[PDB]
Design a protein around this ligand. Sequence first.
Ligand code: NAD
Ligand code: NAD
Lengths: 235, 235
Amino acid sequence: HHMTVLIIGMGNIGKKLVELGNFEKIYAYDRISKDIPGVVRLDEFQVPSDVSTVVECASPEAVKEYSLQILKNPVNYIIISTSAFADEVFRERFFSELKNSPARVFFPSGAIGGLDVLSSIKDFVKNVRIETIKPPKSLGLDLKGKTVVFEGSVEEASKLFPRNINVASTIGLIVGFEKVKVTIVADPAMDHNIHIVRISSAIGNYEFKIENISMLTVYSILRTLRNLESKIIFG
Amino acid sequence: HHMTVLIIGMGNIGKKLVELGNFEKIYAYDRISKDIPGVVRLDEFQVPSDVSTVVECASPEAVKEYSLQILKNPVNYIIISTSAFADEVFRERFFSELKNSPARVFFPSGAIGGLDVLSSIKDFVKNVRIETIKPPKSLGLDLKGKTVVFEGSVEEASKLFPRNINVASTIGLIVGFEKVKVTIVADPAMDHNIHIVRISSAIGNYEFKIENISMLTVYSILRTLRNLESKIIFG
Ligand SMILES: NC(=O)c1ccc[n+]([C@@H]2O[C@H](COP(=O)([O-])OP(=O)(O)OC[C@H]3O[C@@H](n4cnc5c(N)ncnc54)[C@H](O)[C@@H]3O)[C@@H](O)[C@H]2O)c1
Ligand SMILES: NC(=O)c1ccc[n+]([C@@H]2O[C@H](COP(=O)([O-])OP(=O)(O)OC[C@H]3O[C@@H](n4cnc5c(N)ncnc54)[C@H](O)[C@@H]3O)[C@@H](O)[C@H]2O)c1
């Protein structure tokens, strides 16, 4: 129940965070007009001086909008709309500011896993291929067989699928965007989405298959928060 | 080059740590008589007052021997010989002391990955099955086909294979040892060792396949160390 936090975005993830997390005080900023529950609803975006951690779970646009200011504060800054970093200009600017920042940035693994291994051997990574397999229905397609609907860079995928591509962008932040190839497949035999991350490196080869039933992302954030003060740290 | 550290065990991992890491001062404790290089060779185990982090890369026995004392110090304590925790008595004692400890314990993923996901959804995990597939040669066997050489609990495997079983013990620490089933297979079609971790949970199902070419463990430790002071944290 310890810290005071600021949560940007009170949507699916944000409400679940307030619901599950234990905070002494919660500031929240979200353009929406929903009636606030257990949060201090800010009208103007700002970073109250008693905030120790800022959590973004709003959108890539939000990351570009408030990051400049947030980084000026001595806070832990957790980001999940990482697709924003597929933008070279913004990416360059963000980390430029960070070097001069009193803040600390956390990129939880979110909807995928294996990022403990990836960040450990990042310099030796030759390439990472990430494949997302989805039910055709989710794409509004009727197919008799699996079909590739996209293959290319993270930047290109983020443009065509403004929704997804966050997981690939985080991987991009870790190993370098030029080493990540994204493939999106519509498969009629699939009931739900699957993410397969294949890593080739000079240290070894790794494959992480993720089949979620985004509940995982919420718990990913809660763990990052829990780890801020925990005496037992895994991964 | 910042911190002063104590490294327990100057074997394969320990020497690589001193070789790759950048430390201002290194204390080292290892029963061996090798001629020390860039380290202050301690004759009596102790935790110098200027040590900020203690790294164990010696043995499970070492974990049981020095943990009591180490936990009395305000240091980051990184452990990799986790098979020691397969011992209920020791496990109970260790974490009992920790609650009253000024220290912080880190369990890097070591030779495997996906522990970011696992620790995030630990409470929802139904079971974890870890399979280690090895070349028969490594077991001194001549086989015409794949053969199971062991199947059971982490505690049982650690007894029969005093060597391995660390990865399974870390997973055990995360989800509870009763939920981990270990299978060791000797396969004549395999050139090297492979680890396949399959997780079934109420949040989703995950599979992490690790095929290392333990270089990964060294880098796993270095990342934990780097993360102690880094402004950019992944996983
Ligand atoms: N890294 C990952 O693996 C991962 C996983 C799931 C979701 N995400 C991302 O996290 C974000 C939140 O996800 P969600 O499912 O909770 O979304 P949602 O649409 O349900 O909720 C987002 C909320 O953010 C608010 N918002 C958007 N832009 C804002 C801005 N510029 N300023 C203030 N408030 C703003 C919206 O009004 C909305 O209420 C999305 O960008 C999504 O793509 C990342
Ligand atoms: N968690 C993982 O995934 C993982 C991966 C690889 C190795 N390990 C473990 O890490 C440890 C070190 O591995 P290694 O390959 O470097 O081993 P190694 O045998 O090459 O070196 C270990 C060193 O520890 C010293 N040592 C042993 N017990 C000691 C004690 N009680 N007090 C002081 N010094 C002691 C030895 O004399 C030796 O020089 C082992 O227990 C190993 O099983 C864990």
